[PDB]
Amino acid sequence: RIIVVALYDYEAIHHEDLSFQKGDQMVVLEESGEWWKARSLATRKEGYIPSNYVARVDSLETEEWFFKGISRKDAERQLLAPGNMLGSFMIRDSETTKGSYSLSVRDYDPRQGDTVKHYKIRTLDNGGFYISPRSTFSTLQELVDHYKKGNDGLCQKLSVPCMSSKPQKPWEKDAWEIPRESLKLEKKLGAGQFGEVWMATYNKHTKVAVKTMKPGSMSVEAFLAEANVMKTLQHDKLVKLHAVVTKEPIYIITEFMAKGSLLDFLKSDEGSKQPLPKLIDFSAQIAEGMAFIEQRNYIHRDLRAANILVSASLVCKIADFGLARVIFPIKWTAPEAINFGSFTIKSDVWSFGILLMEIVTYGRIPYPGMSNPEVIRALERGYRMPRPENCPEELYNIMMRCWKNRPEERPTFEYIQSVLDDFYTATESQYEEIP
Ligand SMILES: CN1CCN([C@H]2CC[C@H](n3cc(-c4ccc(Oc5ccccc5)cc4)c4c(N)ncnc43)CC2)CC1
Ligand SMILES: [Ca+2]
Ligand SMILES: [Cl-]
Question: Which reaction does it catalyse?
Answer without folding.
Answer: L-tyrosyl-[protein] + ATP = O-phospho-L-tyrosyl-[protein] + ADP + H(+)
